[PDB]
Each structure stands twice: as C-alpha cells, then as structure tokens.
Homo-oligomer: A and B are copies of this chain.
Amino acid sequence: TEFKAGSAKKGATLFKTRCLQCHTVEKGGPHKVGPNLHGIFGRHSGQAEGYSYTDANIKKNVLWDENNMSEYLTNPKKYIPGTKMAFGGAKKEKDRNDLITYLKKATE
C-alpha cells in the first residue's frame, strides 16, 4: 500500500542487531523477552500461546499485515501506548521495508 519490498538479506541483519535480543522467528522457536514471531502476519496482537502480554497489546487487537507492522515499527509506544516492548523505533522507511520484507519471508 505504502510499503515497498526491500532487501531480505539487509532486513535479516537489521533483525539480528535490533530484534534478536528479544525475539525468535522460527517455527518451534521459543518466546524470550519478546514472543516467538512465527506466523505473525494475519494473526491479531497478543495471541501467541504461553506468552504473557501487557493489557495494552491484547486490547489493540492489531491485525499484523506489512502495513500496520510498518506503523508500529516507527514507534511502538505511540502505536500501542502501555506496551513493554522497549524498542525505540525504526525512523527509516528503507530500514523498515527491509525488515518487514525479511519478517514477511522468515515468519511464514
């Protein structure tokens, strides 16, 4: 929509340096600070099982699609006020396109 495909390899590294500390993407992957992200796109916010989400996350009932994920990736707390994700944000569209491209591919 207002999301353009980017570098999958570029995104894989962004993930390692900004997301891996708290999340996993593989199927059969374990939750850590952050919930496992396999099958995220199309799922609504706060539905992974065996993971303890904030009230904030649950109640947004965000349908993850490349578009929304881009909003959220800019500034998680402004997007979902109350959330415990301590990620400052990805101000760069290019950075986000790359990431979501990556996520798009490795979370399926």
Contact = CB atoms under 8 A, between A and B. Distances in A.
Interface of A: 7, 9-10, 12-13, 16-17
A17 B10 contact: yes
A85 to B, nearest CB: 22
A88 to B, nearest CB: 15
Complex copy number for this chain? 2
Contacts of A7: 13, 16-17
A69 to B, nearest CB: 20
A84 B29 CA distance: 48
Nearest to A9: B13
A10 B16 CA distance: 9
A59 B92 CA distance: 39
A12 B12 CA distance: 11
A18 to B, nearest CB: 10
A7 B12 CA distance: 13
Contacts of A16: 7, 9-10
A17 B94 CA distance: 12
